[PDB]
Enzyme design. Structure first.
Site, PDB file in Angstrom:
ATOM      1  N   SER A  26       0.830  -1.187   0.069  1.00 49.56           N
ATOM      2  CA  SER A  26      -0.187   0.002   0.309  1.00 49.56           C
ATOM      3  C   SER A  26       0.963   1.310  -0.054  1.00 49.56           C
ATOM      4  O   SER A  26       1.752   1.385   0.759  1.00 49.56           O
ATOM      5  CB  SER A  26      -0.864  -0.022   1.371  1.00 49.56           C
ATOM      6  OG  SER A  26      -0.063  -0.137   2.282  1.00 49.56           O
ATOM      7  N   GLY A  32      -3.930   4.386  -1.178  1.00 50.02           N
ATOM      8  CA  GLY A  32      -4.297   3.120  -2.064  1.00 50.02           C
ATOM      9  C   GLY A  32      -3.378   1.804  -2.170  1.00 50.02           C
ATOM     10  O   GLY A  32      -2.307   2.290  -1.918  1.00 50.02           O
ATOM     11  N   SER A  33      -3.858   0.721  -2.680  1.00 52.04           N
ATOM     12  CA  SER A  33      -2.733  -0.298  -2.842  1.00 52.04           C
ATOM     13  C   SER A  33      -1.998  -0.270  -4.016  1.00 52.04           C
ATOM     14  O   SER A  33      -2.730   0.488  -5.118  1.00 52.04           O
ATOM     15  CB  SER A  33      -2.988  -1.634  -2.324  1.00 52.04           C
ATOM     16  OG  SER A  33      -4.400  -2.184  -3.209  1.00 52.04           O
ATOM     17  N   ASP A  83       5.453   9.624  -3.907  1.00 47.48           N
ATOM     18  CA  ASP A  83       4.584  10.213  -3.122  1.00 47.48           C
ATOM     19  C   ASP A  83       4.833  11.532  -2.476  1.00 47.48           C
ATOM     20  O   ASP A  83       4.310  11.970  -1.519  1.00 47.48           O
ATOM     21  CB  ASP A  83       4.544   9.273  -2.081  1.00 47.48           C
ATOM     22  CG  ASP A  83       3.889   7.807  -2.409  1.00 47.48           C
ATOM     23  OD1 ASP A  83       3.217   7.810  -3.549  1.00 47.48           O
ATOM     24  OD2 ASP A  83       4.253   6.819  -1.635  1.00 47.48           O
TER      25      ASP A  83
END
Ligand SMILES: CCOC(=O)n1ccc2ccc(C(=O)Nc3cc(C(=O)NC4CC4)ccc3C)cc21
EC number: 2.7.11.24
Length: 338
Positions: free
Chosen positions: A29, A33-34, A165
Protein backbone atom coordinates in the site's frame (compact mmCIF):
# COMPACT_ATOMS: atom_id res chain seq x y z
CA UNK A 1 -11.91 2.97 -28.64
CA UNK A 2 -12.38 2.00 -24.93
CA UNK A 3 -10.16 -1.03 -24.09
CA UNK A 4 -11.52 -4.35 -22.80
CA UNK A 5 -11.38 -4.53 -18.98
CA UNK A 6 -11.13 -7.54 -16.63
CA UNK A 7 -12.02 -8.09 -12.96
CA UNK A 8 -9.63 -9.78 -10.46
CA UNK A 9 -9.57 -9.94 -6.58
CA UNK A 10 -6.33 -8.75 -4.87
CA UNK A 11 -6.07 -7.95 -1.09
CA UNK A 12 -9.89 -8.33 -0.61
CA UNK A 13 -10.56 -5.71 -3.32
CA UNK A 14 -11.70 -6.02 -6.92
CA UNK A 15 -9.22 -4.63 -9.51
CA UNK A 16 -10.79 -3.79 -12.88
CA UNK A 17 -8.04 -2.90 -15.35
CA UNK A 18 -7.58 -2.89 -19.21
CA UNK A 19 -6.33 -6.21 -20.69
CA UNK A 20 -2.98 -4.46 -21.61
CA UNK A 21 -1.93 -4.72 -17.91
CA UNK A 22 -1.17 -8.36 -17.15
CA UNK A 23 0.00 -10.41 -14.12
CA UNK A 24 -1.02 -8.04 -11.29
CA UNK A 25 1.08 -8.81 -8.21
CA UNK A 26 0.60 -6.80 -4.94
CA UNK A 27 3.68 -4.82 -3.84
CA UNK A 28 1.96 -3.16 -0.84
CA UNK A 29 0.00 0.00 0.00
CA UNK A 30 1.44 3.34 -1.08
CA UNK A 31 -0.22 6.80 -0.58
CA UNK A 32 -4.06 6.52 -0.35
CA UNK A 33 -4.39 3.10 -2.11
CA UNK A 34 -2.71 -0.23 -2.82
CA UNK A 35 -0.11 -0.81 -5.56
CA UNK A 36 0.38 -3.78 -7.89
CA UNK A 37 3.31 -4.64 -10.12
CA UNK A 38 2.16 -5.46 -13.66
CA UNK A 39 3.41 -6.28 -17.14
CA UNK A 40 2.39 -3.74 -19.78
CA UNK A 41 1.72 -5.79 -22.96
CA UNK A 42 1.83 -2.55 -25.02
CA UNK A 43 5.47 -1.67 -24.09
CA UNK A 44 6.89 -4.95 -22.68
CA UNK A 45 7.87 -3.04 -19.53
CA UNK A 46 7.04 -3.60 -15.86
CA UNK A 47 4.67 -1.00 -14.37
CA UNK A 48 3.28 -0.02 -10.95
CA UNK A 49 -0.52 0.33 -10.90
CA UNK A 50 -2.28 2.08 -8.01
CA UNK A 51 -5.98 1.72 -7.22
CA UNK A 52 -7.06 4.74 -5.19
CA UNK A 53 -9.05 3.90 -2.07
CA UNK A 54 -12.65 5.27 -2.12
CA UNK A 55 -11.53 8.29 -4.26
CA UNK A 56 -14.88 10.15 -4.07
CA UNK A 57 -16.19 8.91 -0.64
CA UNK A 58 -15.77 12.30 1.07
CA UNK A 59 -14.68 15.87 0.15
CA UNK A 60 -11.15 15.23 1.55
CA UNK A 61 -10.78 12.07 -0.61
CA UNK A 62 -12.17 13.77 -3.78
CA UNK A 63 -9.77 16.80 -3.45
CA UNK A 64 -6.81 14.46 -2.70
CA UNK A 65 -7.71 12.40 -5.85
CA UNK A 66 -7.70 15.66 -7.93
CA UNK A 67 -4.46 16.89 -6.23
CA UNK A 68 -2.64 13.61 -7.03
CA UNK A 69 -3.82 13.28 -10.63
CA UNK A 70 -2.98 17.00 -11.38
CA UNK A 71 0.52 16.53 -9.82
CA UNK A 72 1.25 13.30 -11.77
CA UNK A 73 0.13 14.94 -15.07
CA UNK A 74 2.55 17.90 -14.58
CA UNK A 75 5.67 16.06 -13.29
CA UNK A 76 8.19 15.48 -16.13
CA UNK A 77 11.72 14.78 -14.77
CA UNK A 78 14.11 11.74 -14.66
CA UNK A 79 14.28 11.60 -10.82
CA UNK A 80 10.53 12.25 -10.24
CA UNK A 81 7.82 9.64 -10.81
CA UNK A 82 5.65 10.31 -13.88
CA UNK A 83 2.20 9.23 -15.12
CA UNK A 84 2.30 6.53 -17.84
CA UNK A 85 -1.48 6.08 -17.82
CA UNK A 86 -4.69 6.87 -15.86
CA UNK A 87 -7.94 4.93 -16.32
CA UNK A 88 -11.39 4.18 -14.90
CA UNK A 89 -13.67 1.19 -15.75
CA UNK A 90 -16.50 3.85 -15.82
CA UNK A 91 -18.13 4.80 -19.17
CA UNK A 92 -19.60 8.08 -17.90
CA UNK A 93 -19.18 10.70 -15.12
CA UNK A 94 -22.33 9.19 -13.48
CA UNK A 95 -20.66 5.71 -13.07
CA UNK A 96 -17.23 7.29 -12.17
CA UNK A 97 -16.21 5.89 -8.76
CA UNK A 98 -12.72 4.35 -9.29
CA UNK A 99 -9.33 5.84 -10.35
CA UNK A 100 -6.20 3.85 -11.29
CA UNK A 101 -2.76 5.38 -11.90
CA UNK A 102 0.13 3.79 -13.82
CA UNK A 103 3.86 4.63 -13.34
CA UNK A 104 7.21 2.84 -14.00
CA UNK A 105 8.02 0.16 -11.38
CA UNK A 106 11.92 0.65 -11.53
CA UNK A 107 12.39 -2.57 -9.56
CA UNK A 108 12.32 -1.87 -5.81
CA UNK A 109 12.38 0.88 -3.15
CA UNK A 110 15.58 2.19 -1.49
CA UNK A 111 15.13 -0.07 1.62
CA UNK A 112 15.21 -3.42 -0.27
CA UNK A 113 18.35 -2.25 -2.19
CA UNK A 114 20.39 -0.90 0.77
CA UNK A 115 19.01 -3.44 3.34
CA UNK A 116 20.94 -1.75 6.27
CA UNK A 117 24.28 -1.89 4.48
CA UNK A 118 27.08 0.67 4.89
CA UNK A 119 27.37 2.01 1.29
CA UNK A 120 30.58 3.44 -0.31
CA UNK A 121 31.02 7.25 -0.49
CA UNK A 122 30.72 7.34 -4.37
CA UNK A 123 27.56 5.21 -4.21
CA UNK A 124 26.10 7.68 -1.63
CA UNK A 125 27.12 10.61 -3.99
CA UNK A 126 25.09 9.10 -6.85
CA UNK A 127 21.99 8.31 -4.73
CA UNK A 128 21.84 11.70 -2.90
CA UNK A 129 22.65 13.72 -6.08
CA UNK A 130 19.57 12.09 -7.78
CA UNK A 131 17.19 12.77 -4.82
CA UNK A 132 18.42 16.41 -4.69
CA UNK A 133 18.07 16.87 -8.50
CA UNK A 134 14.46 15.55 -8.24
CA UNK A 135 13.68 17.78 -5.21
CA UNK A 136 15.05 20.89 -7.05
CA UNK A 137 12.46 20.20 -9.79
CA UNK A 138 9.57 19.44 -7.33
CA UNK A 139 10.43 22.51 -5.18
CA UNK A 140 10.52 24.83 -8.28
CA UNK A 141 6.79 23.94 -8.91
CA UNK A 142 6.09 25.03 -5.27
CA UNK A 143 5.56 21.36 -4.32
CA UNK A 144 7.15 19.70 -1.28
CA UNK A 145 7.30 16.07 -0.22
CA UNK A 146 6.95 16.76 3.60
CA UNK A 147 7.36 12.94 4.27
CA UNK A 148 10.45 11.84 2.27
CA UNK A 149 11.87 8.47 3.44
CA UNK A 150 13.79 5.51 1.82
CA UNK A 151 10.48 3.71 1.01
CA UNK A 152 9.46 6.71 -1.31
CA UNK A 153 12.55 6.29 -3.49
CA UNK A 154 12.05 3.80 -6.38
CA UNK A 155 15.38 2.52 -7.65
CA UNK A 156 16.69 0.63 -10.76
CA UNK A 157 19.23 -2.25 -11.10
CA UNK A 158 21.70 0.60 -12.04
CA UNK A 159 20.78 2.69 -8.95
CA UNK A 160 18.78 5.22 -11.06
CA UNK A 161 16.20 6.74 -8.72
CA UNK A 162 12.67 8.33 -8.89
CA UNK A 163 10.90 10.09 -6.00
CA UNK A 164 7.38 8.89 -5.14
CA UNK A 165 4.46 10.23 -3.03
CA UNK A 166 5.47 13.95 -2.94
CA UNK A 167 2.84 16.74 -2.60
CA UNK A 168 0.28 14.62 -0.70
CA UNK A 169 1.32 14.80 3.02
CA UNK A 170 4.35 5.28 9.07
CA UNK A 171 8.04 5.95 10.29
CA UNK A 172 8.90 9.38 11.85
CA UNK A 173 12.75 8.77 11.60
CA UNK A 174 13.21 11.17 8.57
CA UNK A 175 10.69 13.85 9.63
CA UNK A 176 11.84 17.48 10.09
CA UNK A 177 11.70 18.51 13.79
CA UNK A 178 9.67 21.68 12.90
CA UNK A 179 6.80 19.43 11.65
CA UNK A 180 6.99 17.41 14.90
CA UNK A 181 7.15 20.53 17.04
CA UNK A 182 4.08 21.69 14.92
CA UNK A 183 5.66 25.10 14.09
CA UNK A 184 3.36 25.55 11.03
CA UNK A 185 5.68 28.14 9.42
CA UNK A 186 8.20 25.87 7.62
CA UNK A 187 9.69 25.88 4.13
CA UNK A 188 10.83 23.48 1.34
CA UNK A 189 13.96 22.49 3.33
CA UNK A 190 11.74 20.10 5.45
CA UNK A 191 12.70 17.72 2.52
CA UNK A 192 16.41 18.62 2.89
CA UNK A 193 16.27 17.42 6.55
CA UNK A 194 14.95 14.03 5.29
CA UNK A 195 17.77 13.94 2.65
CA UNK A 196 20.31 14.49 5.51
CA UNK A 197 18.86 11.57 7.60
CA UNK A 198 18.99 9.27 4.49
CA UNK A 199 22.54 10.29 3.53
CA UNK A 200 23.90 9.72 7.10
CA UNK A 201 22.25 6.22 7.21
CA UNK A 202 23.65 5.25 3.74
CA UNK A 203 27.15 6.42 4.96
CA UNK A 204 27.07 4.72 8.47
CA UNK A 205 24.68 1.75 7.93
CA UNK A 206 22.52 2.92 10.85
CA UNK A 207 19.35 5.06 11.24
CA UNK A 208 20.47 8.55 12.38
CA UNK A 209 17.41 9.21 14.58
CA UNK A 210 15.68 5.86 15.39
CA UNK A 211 13.08 7.25 17.85
CA UNK A 212 10.74 4.75 19.61
CA UNK A 213 7.91 7.35 19.80
CA UNK A 214 7.06 11.06 19.25
CA UNK A 215 8.85 12.25 22.50
CA UNK A 216 11.94 10.03 21.82
CA UNK A 217 12.17 11.21 18.19
CA UNK A 218 12.64 14.89 19.29
CA UNK A 219 14.98 13.84 22.18
CA UNK A 220 17.26 11.98 19.65
CA UNK A 221 17.19 14.87 17.07
CA UNK A 222 18.06 17.54 19.77
CA UNK A 223 20.95 15.40 21.13
CA UNK A 224 22.88 15.87 17.81
CA UNK A 225 21.72 19.33 16.52
CA UNK A 226 21.31 20.95 19.94
CA UNK A 227 18.48 22.80 21.69
CA UNK A 228 17.42 26.06 19.80
CA UNK A 229 19.97 28.87 19.96
CA UNK A 230 19.20 32.55 20.78
CA UNK A 231 18.70 33.43 17.07
CA UNK A 232 16.04 30.69 16.58
CA UNK A 233 14.23 31.44 19.89
CA UNK A 234 13.64 35.12 18.81
CA UNK A 235 11.66 33.76 15.73
CA UNK A 236 8.98 31.98 17.82
CA UNK A 237 5.92 34.31 17.98
CA UNK A 238 3.78 32.36 20.53
CA UNK A 239 5.16 32.44 24.13
CA UNK A 240 3.45 29.02 24.90
CA UNK A 241 5.43 27.56 21.94
CA UNK A 242 8.67 29.23 23.07
CA UNK A 243 8.09 27.89 26.63
CA UNK A 244 7.48 24.31 25.34
CA UNK A 245 10.70 23.68 23.28
CA UNK A 246 12.82 25.47 25.95
CA UNK A 247 11.66 22.82 28.52
CA UNK A 248 12.95 19.76 26.54
CA UNK A 249 16.29 19.92 28.51
CA UNK A 250 19.20 21.96 27.09
CA UNK A 251 21.54 20.23 24.66
CA UNK A 252 24.66 21.64 22.95
CA UNK A 253 25.12 21.15 19.20
CA UNK A 254 27.53 18.27 18.47
CA UNK A 255 30.40 18.65 15.96
CA UNK A 256 29.46 16.30 13.07
CA UNK A 257 33.19 15.50 12.34
CA UNK A 258 33.26 13.80 15.80
CA UNK A 259 30.09 11.73 14.96
CA UNK A 260 30.69 10.66 11.32
CA UNK A 261 34.36 9.75 11.94
CA UNK A 262 36.20 8.48 8.86
CA UNK A 263 33.58 9.90 6.45
CA UNK A 264 34.50 12.15 3.50
CA UNK A 265 35.00 15.70 5.00
CA UNK A 266 32.79 17.09 2.18
CA UNK A 267 29.98 14.61 3.22
CA UNK A 268 30.29 15.88 6.87
CA UNK A 269 30.13 19.53 5.68
CA UNK A 270 27.03 18.89 3.53
CA UNK A 271 25.34 17.03 6.47
CA UNK A 272 26.06 20.12 8.70
CA UNK A 273 24.28 22.27 6.09
CA UNK A 274 21.36 19.78 5.70
CA UNK A 275 20.75 19.09 9.42
CA UNK A 276 20.53 22.65 10.73
CA UNK A 277 17.62 23.01 13.24
CA UNK A 278 16.82 26.53 11.86
CA UNK A 279 14.93 25.94 8.56
CA UNK A 280 15.77 29.54 7.45
CA UNK A 281 19.51 28.59 7.46
CA UNK A 282 19.16 25.05 6.05
CA UNK A 283 20.59 24.51 2.53
CA UNK A 284 18.23 24.35 -0.50
CA UNK A 285 18.07 21.49 -3.08
CA UNK A 286 19.67 23.87 -5.73
CA UNK A 287 22.46 25.03 -3.35
CA UNK A 288 23.18 21.40 -2.24
CA UNK A 289 23.61 20.29 -5.92
CA UNK A 290 26.45 22.90 -6.29
CA UNK A 291 28.27 21.62 -3.14
CA UNK A 292 31.82 20.23 -3.75
CA UNK A 293 30.60 16.77 -2.51
CA UNK A 294 28.82 16.31 -5.92
CA UNK A 295 31.71 17.69 -8.12
CA UNK A 296 31.77 14.40 -10.14
CA UNK A 297 27.95 14.47 -10.82
CA UNK A 298 27.01 18.19 -10.86
CA UNK A 299 26.03 19.69 -14.24
CA UNK A 300 24.26 23.10 -14.01
CA UNK A 301 22.98 22.63 -17.62
CA UNK A 302 21.22 19.32 -16.76
CA UNK A 303 19.37 20.13 -13.47
CA UNK A 304 16.05 21.41 -14.83
CA UNK A 305 13.23 23.22 -13.03
CA UNK A 306 9.46 22.68 -13.49
CA UNK A 307 7.12 24.57 -15.86
CA UNK A 308 4.74 26.95 -13.91
CA UNK A 309 2.21 24.84 -11.99
CA UNK A 310 -1.33 26.04 -11.39
CA UNK A 311 -2.39 24.80 -7.98
CA UNK A 312 -5.03 27.53 -7.21
CA UNK A 313 -7.54 24.60 -6.61
CA UNK A 314 -5.83 24.24 -3.14
CA UNK A 315 -7.57 27.37 -1.79
CA UNK A 316 -11.00 26.15 -3.08
CA UNK A 317 -13.81 24.59 -0.96
CA UNK A 318 -15.85 22.54 -3.44
CA UNK A 319 -18.46 19.71 -3.28
CA UNK A 320 -17.63 15.98 -3.97
CA UNK A 321 -19.40 16.19 -7.36
CA UNK A 322 -17.35 19.23 -8.50
CA UNK A 323 -14.00 17.55 -7.48
CA UNK A 324 -15.25 14.29 -9.14
CA UNK A 325 -16.14 16.16 -12.39
CA UNK A 326 -12.79 18.06 -12.38
CA UNK A 327 -10.96 14.66 -11.93
CA UNK A 328 -13.04 12.98 -14.71
CA UNK A 329 -12.07 15.75 -17.22
CA UNK A 330 -8.39 15.22 -16.25
CA UNK A 331 -8.70 11.47 -16.88
CA UNK A 332 -10.37 11.83 -20.35
CA UNK A 333 -7.89 14.61 -21.48
CA UNK A 334 -4.79 12.55 -20.48
CA UNK A 335 -2.10 12.32 -23.20
CA UNK A 336 0.28 9.32 -22.75
CA UNK A 337 4.01 10.25 -22.84
CA UNK A 338 6.11 9.32 -25.99
C1 LIG B 1 3.77 0.77 -2.00
C2 LIG B 1 4.90 -0.14 -2.13
O1 LIG B 1 5.50 0.15 -3.43
C3 LIG B 1 6.70 -0.37 -3.67
O2 LIG B 1 7.26 -1.16 -2.95
N1 LIG B 1 7.29 0.11 -4.88
C4 LIG B 1 8.50 -0.36 -5.38
C5 LIG B 1 8.78 0.25 -6.56
C6 LIG B 1 7.71 1.16 -6.85
C7 LIG B 1 7.46 2.08 -7.87
C8 LIG B 1 6.33 2.88 -7.85
C9 LIG B 1 5.41 2.77 -6.80
C10 LIG B 1 4.21 3.66 -6.67
O3 LIG B 1 3.66 3.84 -5.59
N2 LIG B 1 3.82 4.28 -7.81
C11 LIG B 1 2.90 5.35 -7.88
C12 LIG B 1 3.20 6.54 -7.22
C13 LIG B 1 2.32 7.62 -7.26
C14 LIG B 1 2.82 8.87 -6.63
O4 LIG B 1 4.00 8.97 -6.30
N3 LIG B 1 1.93 9.86 -6.44
C15 LIG B 1 2.26 11.12 -5.78
C16 LIG B 1 1.57 12.34 -6.23
C17 LIG B 1 2.99 12.13 -6.56
C18 LIG B 1 1.10 7.47 -7.92
C19 LIG B 1 0.79 6.29 -8.57
C20 LIG B 1 1.67 5.20 -8.56
C21 LIG B 1 1.30 3.90 -9.23
C22 LIG B 1 5.65 1.86 -5.77
C23 LIG B 1 6.79 1.06 -5.79
Amino acid sequence: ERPTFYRQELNKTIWEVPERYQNLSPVGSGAYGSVCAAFDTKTGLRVAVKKLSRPFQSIIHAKRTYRELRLLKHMKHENVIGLLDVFTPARSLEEFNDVYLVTHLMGADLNNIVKCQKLTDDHVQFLIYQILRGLKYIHSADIIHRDLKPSNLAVNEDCELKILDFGLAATRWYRAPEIMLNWMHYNQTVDIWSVGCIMAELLTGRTLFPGTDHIDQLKLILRLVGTPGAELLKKISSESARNYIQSLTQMPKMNFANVFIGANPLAVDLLEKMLVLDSDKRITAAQALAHAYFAQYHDPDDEPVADPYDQSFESRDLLIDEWKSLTYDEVISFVPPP
